[PDB]
Amino acid sequence: KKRYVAMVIWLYSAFRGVQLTYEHTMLQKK
Structure with missing residues (x-):
């Protein structure tokens, strides 16, 4: 298991x- 990565993986x-995928239409495929 990771620690420094499994703790920041959230960000x-x-x-x-939640940005390039959040769109799910415009930013999705672009």
Whole structure:
């Protein structure tokens, strides 16, 4: 298991599934 990565993974997996993926239409495929 990770610690420094498993603790920040939230931010590393939030700016992607809530920005470029949040759109789900425009930013989705672009």
